[PDB]
Ligand binder design. Structure first.
Ligand SMILES: [Cl-]
Ligand SMILES: [Cl-]
Ligand code: NA
Ligand code: NA
Length: 599
């Protein structure tokens, strides 16, 4: 009849008659699994063969997949007015693997992941779609992990008696030895035994998982999932997140400024109490929203902040939000401004208003490759390029955070260990960066991101200095906070992969010099601004050196704390040389930079 048993009949191979209407199969999993006290991931998959190009499949009304031979459309979610929706353009003809991940555990994410693998004749994995995230809410996830129905119906088939062939249908579970960071990044692939080796190949680096998931245990619960041989295109791993109610730029900014998962902002129910969420996450999200709702163009951010701070009670909601957290506002608004500007310049089809609601495409970028590009279909999305950050190079010693009282749990000993780890991973020190506390948190944990800057376009980029004393001058608030006090900031150490050194140049000229622009372009071999390259030269005639990293290069830095403290009793004062640890000086010489263009 209408029913069939997916995991028993299609574990090897089945041919489903679709000529008489929809076919359905219950997918039941032992409830003891969804109720585990630990954490795990259920990986549901099946290979769709002949007939996979004229289908409308569904898991209850929670997830729908429409395949017409050209695209595979996905839509679903728990929220009734704005379905989460995605569309994957097929890159091949033939069989494809349908995959969805359901997390289990008490503090689990409230969404599922969905992805598609295209397979060649040899049954090898040839292409992989982006990893799509669909918000479900806690209760619906529980239902998807225990009892849901899989529906299959022919859709615009040209067959007189349509059929669908399915093979290797099944479900597995991986239990960790609560950590959910991999789930939101490219490392989610590292949790899936069925895809061993993919992350290493595409990210060009080992999974290097922390103990929790490193010691995972895998088990097939039903059916017989496939483990495809690889013949995959080197396309970087990507994620795509659709914001049905808009607010993507605000969420992206909050996630990058605060080091909070992007998907925390698309949750069905907002978490409460979380310190970083209440103090940074929601405030930053709201600030960007207010700016967008005020109908202000991003190129006026500096003046908007200046006016809000200069006149109490002015600016209304946005003005008050800014005055409430001056530096956090500057970080948030300049981050959003830079991303909106980039989005608009991606194509004539993008504008400032659209940047506010565009999907976010997150890329797992190899550190040695050239520039990190997303899928052809990502030109209409906000983009994030992810590389290893300081968060991975802090070593043991406890939680690190930034405060006026100094960097938490950070000592010379810890710095030396971190520096050695960086060397072992192929990184090299290129200088110091001084900044305010909130920016230090963003940069070290979330990674360096472009921010709008009020300076000539040709000189925009990430500013650092080999001399900690020059960077120290920037390590403080540039404007008093709500309580009218200029806080000391933090001094940070900036590293880059050694493979990036050939792109570092030096000049004897000061950047203000009229000959500067042309000379730097001659050295880097292309028009400014800087891209995967950098320039070092005197900050002024007879001055200390300053280094600018092009934003693409800045994004792949690893930034960690310096053991040189900022003096809370002398904010605005010069760095006292005796406060620099001798052992930190010993690991702070700078590389030999090129003084001529490449041959
Ligand atoms: Cl149906
Ligand atoms: Cl020392
Ligand atoms: Na079709
Ligand atoms: Na639906």
């Amino acid at each position: 009849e209408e029913a069939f048993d997916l995991w028993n009949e299609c574990a090897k191979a089945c041919v489903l008659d679709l000529k008489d209407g929809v076919r359905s199969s219950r997918m039941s999993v032992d409830p003891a699994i969804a109720d585990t006290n630990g954490q795990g991931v259920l990986h549901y998959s099946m290979v769709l063969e002949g007939g996979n190009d004229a289908l409308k499949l569904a898991i209850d009304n929670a997830l729908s997949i429409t395949s017409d031979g050209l695209t595979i459309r996905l839509e679903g979610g728990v929220e009734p007015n704005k379905p989460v929706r995605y569309s994957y353009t097929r890159q091949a003809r033939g069989s494809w693997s349908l995959n969805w991940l359901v997390p289990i555990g008490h503090e689990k994410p409230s969404n599922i992941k969905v992805f598609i693998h295209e397979l060649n004749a040899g049954n090898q994995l040839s292409h992989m779609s982006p990893i799509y995230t669909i918000e479900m809410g806690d209760e619906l996830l529980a239902k998807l992990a225990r009892d849901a129905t899989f529906f299959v119906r022919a859709h615009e088939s040209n067959e007189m008696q349509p059929t669908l062939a399915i093979s290797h249908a099944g479900v597995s579970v991986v239990m960790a030895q609560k950590r959910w960071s991999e789930w939101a990044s490219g490392k989610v692939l590292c949790l899936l035994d069925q895809l061993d080796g993919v992350y290493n190949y595409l990210a060009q680096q080992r999974c290097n998982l922390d103990d929790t998931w490193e010691g995972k245990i895998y088990r097939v619960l039903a059916g017989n999932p496939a483990k495809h041989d690889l013949d995959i295109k080197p396309t970087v791993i990507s994620h795509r997140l659709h914001f049905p109610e808009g607010g993507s730029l605000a969420a992206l900014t909050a996630h990058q400024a605060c080091h909070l998962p992007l998907e925390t902002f698309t949750r069905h129910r907002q978490p409460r109490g979380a310190e970083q969420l209440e103090q940074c996450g929601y405030p930053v999200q709201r600030l960007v929203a207010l700016y967008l709702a005020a109908r202000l163009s991003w190129n006026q951010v500096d003046q908007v902040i200046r006016n809000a701070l200069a006149s109490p009670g002015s600016g209304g909601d946005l003005g008050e939000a800014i005055r409430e957290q001056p530096e956090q506002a500057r970080l948030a608004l300049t981050l959003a401004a830079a991303e909106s500007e980039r989005f608009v310049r991606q194509g004539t089809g993008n504008d400032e208003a659209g940047a506010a609601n565009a999907d976010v495409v997150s890329l797992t970028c190899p550190v040695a490759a050239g520039e990190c590009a997303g899928p052809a279909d990502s030109g209409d999305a906000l983009l994030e390029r992810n590389y290893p950050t300081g968060a991975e190079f802090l070593g043991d010693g406890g939680d690190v955070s930034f405060s006026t009282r100094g960097t938490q749990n950070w000592t010379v000993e810890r710095l030396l260990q971190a520096h050695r780890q960086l060397e072992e991973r192929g990184y090299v020190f290129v200088g110091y960066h001084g900044t305010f506390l909130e920016a230090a948190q963003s940069i070290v944990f979330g990674g360096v991101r472009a921010r709008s800057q009020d300076l000539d376009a040709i000189w925009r980029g990430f500013y650092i200095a080999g001399d900690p004393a020059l960077a120290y001058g920037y390590a403080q608030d540039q404007e008093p906070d709500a309580r009218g006090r200029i806080r000391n900031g933090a001094l940070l150490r900036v590293y880059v992969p050694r493979s990036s050194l050939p792109g570092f140049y030096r000049t004897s000229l000061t950047l203000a010099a009229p000959e500067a622009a042309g000379e730097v372009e001659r050295l880097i071999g292309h028009p400014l601004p800087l891209r995967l390259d950098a320039i070092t030269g005197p900050e002024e005639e007879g001055g200390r050196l300053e280094t600018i990293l092009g934003w693409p290069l800045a994004e792949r830095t690893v930034v960690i704390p310096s053991a040189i403290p900022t003096d809370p009793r002398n904010v605005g004062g010069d760095l006292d040389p005796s406060s620099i640890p001798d052992k930190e000086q010993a690991i702070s010489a700078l590389p030999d930079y090129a003084s001529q263009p490449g041959k």
